[PDB]
Write a protein that binds this ligand. Sequence first.
Ligand code: HEM
Ligand code: HEM
Lengths: 146, 139
Amino acid sequence: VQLSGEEKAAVLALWDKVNEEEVGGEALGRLLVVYPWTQRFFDSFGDLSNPGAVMGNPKVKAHGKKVLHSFGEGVHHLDNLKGTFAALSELHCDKLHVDPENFRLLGNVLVVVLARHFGKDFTPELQASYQKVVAGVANALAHKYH
Amino acid sequence: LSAADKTNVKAAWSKVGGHAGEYGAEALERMFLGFPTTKTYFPHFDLSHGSAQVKAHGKKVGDALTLAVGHLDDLPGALSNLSDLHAHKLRVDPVNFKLLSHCLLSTLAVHLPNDFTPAVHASLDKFLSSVSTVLTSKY
Ligand code: HEM
Ligand code: HEM
């Protein structure tokens, strides 16, 4: 990802404040509510029918935490996103058959959640940096479809 | 847009209230910085932080969205001058509507965190897609 030193430091400094459980659980929950076809991949989690059911589902929280943890790995390895997400790219392509469009959707949801949690500290400049990160992650996840 | 979506959109916009223009301006700024390809539609603007042209244009965007919320049953009739502008005169790439939509939701999350619930998020997403559709529908 093309980030200046300034931008990297700002990205890393925000991540220090990210609660992976709360942000993760919220991001995955909002994906399932806002883009309901995404529910097809998570039938094993039980009832995802209304928004109440989605946001309090403990499997949604636990999975959301794993997702954000793995995003954090990417934030800490921005020089090697291809290598960091190789195994996950294979899983999502060959085992799960997730269309890569949905990786961009989740990245964008994550950005909206960061905005919600951080308010006026999530400046337009900081958001711009985060858009570069979520795009880099989405592309590295898409790598083993190409 | 279902009856439930329309209620949620009317509700959420009532909380936006008089801030529509300031949020429109902030969404534009978030878009220009986040997605630099969008700047090429605005060669005639000063795009620096707090430029007055962006504030003025943000107001016009906010006002049009307020208009749309009042005409949810007839978005085509209410927005059709703007469809002509965006499709025939400006030839805006349809992708750019999704970017601005994302930037507006981001802005709303910043300023209305308690009101920006998952159900309200879902209904606003649908509202902004429906508007986008109308503004790209004349090609
Ligand atoms: C874009 C960022 C995304 C990241 C970082 C990510 C990351 C992960 C991780 C870390 C796992 C756990 C694998 C394991 O425990 O071995 C996983 C599993 C999975 N992901 Fe993703 N994912 C992403 C997007 C998506 C999207 C958009 C979908 C679906 C629409 C999806 C569906 C799944 C499913 C079904 C599993 C297996 C769940 C289970 O069996 O418990 N992922 N993902
Ligand atoms: C929700 C989506 C949008 C709304 C409601 C909207 C609304 C408007 C309005 C109300 C005008 C001014 C009409 C007038 O004063 O005659 C306008 C003009 C314009 N719009 Fe949009 N717009 C949208 C999306 C976009 C996007 C995505 C772009 C490009 C990235 C764009 C580019 C422009 C440009 C270049 C003009 C002419 C500005 C000027 O010369 O002053 N619009 N739009």
